[PDB]
Amino acid sequence: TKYKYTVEESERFNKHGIDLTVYGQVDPSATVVRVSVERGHFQEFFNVRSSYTYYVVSGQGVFYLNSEAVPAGATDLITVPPNTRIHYFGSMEMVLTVAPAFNEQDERHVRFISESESPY
């Protein structure tokens, strides 16, 4: 059994202004990924099946959850139910849990967000 996954062996890419680290573990109950963000996630989306739970390792930002501003800082936990519109601005390092496991078929695009809208 493979228990340990490393950053060296992960898939690392930029998506809508964030840097994602996808470790490549397979577990139907949850997908855990790393997110690094310099200014924002410049796209609003929702997921019809999975909750999105962000742990803020470091930094400061603001989530927009169904257009409601939710400030976030280091050590905060942001828990987003399924079918909730999400975007965010900030300079932050985060651990993101998607539960149950992320499936691209469950994701929906709402709108792009102008890069000038981030105060970071």
Author numbering: 2 to 121
Direct quotes from the study:
Solution of the structure required the preparation of the seleno‐methionine derivative (SeMet‐Pac13) and demonstrated that the enzyme was indeed a cupin.
In pacidamycin 3, biosynthesis the 3′‐deoxy moiety is mediated by Pac13, an enzyme found to catalyze the key dehydration of uridine‐5′‐aldehyde 1 to form 3′‐deoxy‐3′,4′‐didehydrouridine‐5′‐aldehyde 2. In stark contrast to most characterised dehydratases, Pac13 is small (121 aa), monomeric, co‐factor independent and utilises a non‐activated nucleoside, rather than a free monosaccharide, as a substrate. Pac13 is the only monomeric, metal‐free cupin dehydratase characterised to date.
